[PDB]
Structures are given as structure tokens and as C-alpha cells.
Amino acid sequence: QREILQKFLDEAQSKKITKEEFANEFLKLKRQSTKYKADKTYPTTVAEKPKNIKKNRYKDILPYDYSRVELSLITSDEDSSYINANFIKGVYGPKAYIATQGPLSTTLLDFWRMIWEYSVLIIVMACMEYEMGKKKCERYWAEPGEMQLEFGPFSVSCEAEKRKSDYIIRTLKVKFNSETRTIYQFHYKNWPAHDVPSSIDPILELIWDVRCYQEDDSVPICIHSSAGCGRTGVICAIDYTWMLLKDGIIPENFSVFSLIREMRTQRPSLVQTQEQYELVYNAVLELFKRQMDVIR
Amino acid sequence: DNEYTAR
């Protein structure tokens, strides 16, 4: 491992990646997903049902069937099984990450159903309510002072808001019929759909923080942006890479390309821009750096 | 009708 990393590091130092390179790199990824439509490799038939088609915030952003997060917790006669969400495999097993879109008004209740069903503790919001004029996500959380917001049978209040330098940790209390849970919502603002931060540093603090609350894959961690692809992708790719590092199992053939390619067969369009692709690269190269430290 | 893509 110590030698795997310093090799990785010395090559990166030895050959800088250019913008034209990263654009060539990212085009390959766009090509593969386009070859998945052509070939019908991963049908999106459930999402395409007329009963489901308006539950999708973006019409070309349709979850694959085989990896879709299915709902079965019933709270009314109108409760159905569809949400725009995919499981993404972690280092050790399936269902490490739930990648979903920002809820619409008609899917706020779906959202909470999903959270509750899968015993999610952690919610990562890589998104703002408004972005370039447009509504990007509806309010499913509660703030301090507001008491309990009501989503169907779910009652959502907020104990504490920790305002950190670049995101907020909201401690949510979610009552469902008789039982109460705590969910940590990590809310990262000033990062639009796609643009990118700087530095890479807040994003690594955020993932560092998240992993303090849940170090394992016992339950899915929920990651969402507006679409559930872009900013979402960035976070899953970075978190997954950091797990490989921290447990000292980064392979010799390690590739940011390959990881992202693999994630993209599970939730469509994960990491949506070459700039976001670069961000995951630079973030990963910073993590390797910090892992050499942990060795020394 | 409503897209994403994207970028």
C-alpha cells in the first residue's frame, strides 16, 4: 500500500492531465451510457410508465430498473413502489449509497418512505433550493423554531443545526406513527449543478464528517442533488475511493475512470461534467496525499 | 420535457 500510493502520486506528478485530456476522458463515459440506450442494456421501463413519468424531475434522467430503489412501506392507498433512486454498490457490498433526485412536491412522502424503509441515518444534500432562477429541490427537512413538518404519517423536526464553514449538519427527528429516529442531514450550499467548488477541501471535510457518524455499510447513506447524478456521482466516487484508501485496499490497477464507469452502470449519468470528473480526480489525488501521511 | 443530461 505505501508503495502503491507513492507510485500513483509520482505518476500524477510526472504527467499532468490537461483539460483536453479530461474532456477526451469524459466523452468516453458519455459514449458508454449512449451505447447503453442503443443496446437496451439497462432498461428504464418502470420509470417510463405513465403512472411514474411525472415523478421524475428530469425527463432524460431515468433510473435503471435492475438497480432502482423499490418502495413497499405503505402509508395510504395511493402509495406506490416507484421513486427516482438507485442503489450504488460500496467497496464491500450492494446498497452502500442511495442516489436520488431532489424531491418534487408529489414525492416528498415517497422520499421519507424510502428513508424510513431502508433505515437511512445519513442524508447528503449536494444542492440548493434555488439555482439559476429555478427550483431544484423541495423542502423535506425541518429547521429550528419550525416544529414538526408533516409528510403523510412522517413528522420531521430539527433539534440542532451545526453550521460549519461550507455546509450545515442538521439533526433531524422523524416520528413515524409511534417510533422516533435521528437522521443527520448534511447540506452543502454554493455548489451548483454543472459548476464546481473550490477547494476540494470542504467536500473532504464533509465526507470526513459523514463517516464519523457512520463508518460502515450497515445501512445505505442517502446522497442527492437536483438530478441525483452529477454532484451525487462526485461524492460517491470520492467516498468509495477514500474507503479503499483507509482500509488499505487500493488496487495496483487503480483508476478513477474505471470506478466512475462502474458507478455509471448503476445510476445513469453519474458525474455529469468533465469539470466534476476533474474534481473527483484532484480530490482522489489529495486523499492519496493524506493517506501517505497516515502511513508516515 | 424537462432535461438534465447534462451540463
Side-chain angles (χ1 to χ4, degrees), chain A residues 1 4-15 17-48 50-177 179-251 253-295, chain B:
Chain A
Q1 288 297 292
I4 282 155
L5 273 50
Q6 165 68 61
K7 170 133 182 324
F8 196 88
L9 289 173
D10 295 321
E11 309 184 60
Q13 193 34 45
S14 266
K15 166 66 181 53
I17 315 285
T18 78
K19 299 268 214 83
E20 195 192 4
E21 278 145 22
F22 286 120
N24 286 320
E25 218 52 353
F26 194 73
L27 184 58
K28 316 209 177 293
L29 294 174
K30 288 192 338 257
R31 294 183 184 144
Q32 326 147 337
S33 301
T34 301
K35 172 68 155 157
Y36 313 140
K37 59 79 173 313
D39 290 15
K40 291 160 208 285
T41 309
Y42 306 115
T44 56
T45 69
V46 179
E48 272 157 353
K51 182 191 183 68
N52 298 323
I53 216 42
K54 309 230 188 82
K55 297 166 182 151
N56 303 302
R57 173 175 297 273
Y58 306 108
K59 140 284 143 200
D60 47 312
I61 307 277
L62 285 210
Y64 310 138
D65 286 344
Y66 86 97
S67 74
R68 83 178 183 99
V69 185
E70 231 191 313
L71 305 183
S72 74
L73 174 51
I74 282 123
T75 84
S76 65
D77 298 335
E78 275 82 292
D79 282 356
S80 197
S81 73
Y82 182 80
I83 195 174
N84 191 319
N86 303 89
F87 297 110
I88 291 138
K89 291 155 130 86
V91 171
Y92 299 115
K95 314 194 197 177
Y97 319 93
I98 290 161
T100 194
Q101 74 179 10
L104 288 165
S105 331
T106 53
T107 80
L108 285 162
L109 175 48
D110 307 319
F111 177 94
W112 282 105
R113 288 179 59 221
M114 185 184 62
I115 294 301
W116 196 268
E117 177 169 1
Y118 294 87
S119 304
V120 170
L121 186 71
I122 313 281
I123 307 174
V124 186
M125 197 167 150
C127 189
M128 297 176 105
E129 283 191 75
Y130 302 78
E131 269 168 40
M132 313 260 93
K134 314 270 191 252
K135 192 65 162 303
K136 299 297 175 190
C137 184
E138 309 280 314
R139 178 86 94 83
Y140 63 78
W141 62 101
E143 304 178 7
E146 304 196 312
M147 298 315 261
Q148 321 194 105
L149 289 68
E150 312 276 308
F151 301 101
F154 304 88
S155 176
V156 183
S157 53
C158 179
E159 209 151 78
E161 258 210 11
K162 171 87 103 167
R163 305 188 76 87
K164 284 220 178 166
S165 220
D166 305 72
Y167 47 90
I168 316 166
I169 323 172
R170 279 190 199 103
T171 312
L172 307 174
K173 303 287 149 214
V174 197
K175 229 269 258 343
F176 171 50
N177 73 31
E179 158 183 352
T180 306
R181 307 175 189 173
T182 310
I183 324 279
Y184 307 96
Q185 169 207 42
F186 290 76
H187 184 192
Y188 192 119
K189 324 215 219 195
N190 246 302
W191 180 24
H194 316 112
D195 225 336
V196 284
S198 26
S199 20
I200 83 273
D201 287 333
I203 275 182
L204 306 181
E205 219 217 328
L206 186 154
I207 302 162
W208 165 275
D209 278 345
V210 154
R211 277 308 179 177
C212 285
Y213 293 62
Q214 197 174 317
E215 61 190 70
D216 78 338
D217 68 346
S218 26
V219 294
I221 297 170
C222 178
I223 304 170
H224 81 84
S225 36
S226 191
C229 309
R231 291 168 284 176
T232 304
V234 167
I235 296 141
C236 312
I238 302 158
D239 186 86
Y240 189 115
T241 308
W242 206 347
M243 195 62 53
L244 288 182
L245 287 159
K246 272 182 295 189
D247 301 354
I249 65 185
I250 281 280
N253 60 11
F254 193 80
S255 171
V256 188
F257 197 86
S258 298
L259 181 45
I260 298 195
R261 168 184 199 154
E262 191 190 356
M263 301 186 157
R264 261 163 107 97
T265 62
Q266 298 165 260
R267 164 89 179 158
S269 280
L270 269 179
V271 183
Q272 271 173 313
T273 76
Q274 99 165 251
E275 298 72 15
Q276 277 167 12
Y277 183 79
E278 321 176 13
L279 190 59
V280 172
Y281 178 89
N282 287 342
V284 169
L285 191 84
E286 175 66 22
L287 292 175
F288 264 77
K289 225 144 262 203
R290 308 187 175 178
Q291 199 56 24
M292 272 311 297
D293 282 8
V294 171
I295 286 142
Chain B
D1 48 49
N2 246 293
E3 136 143 36
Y4 238 156
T5 266
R7 69 211 188 181

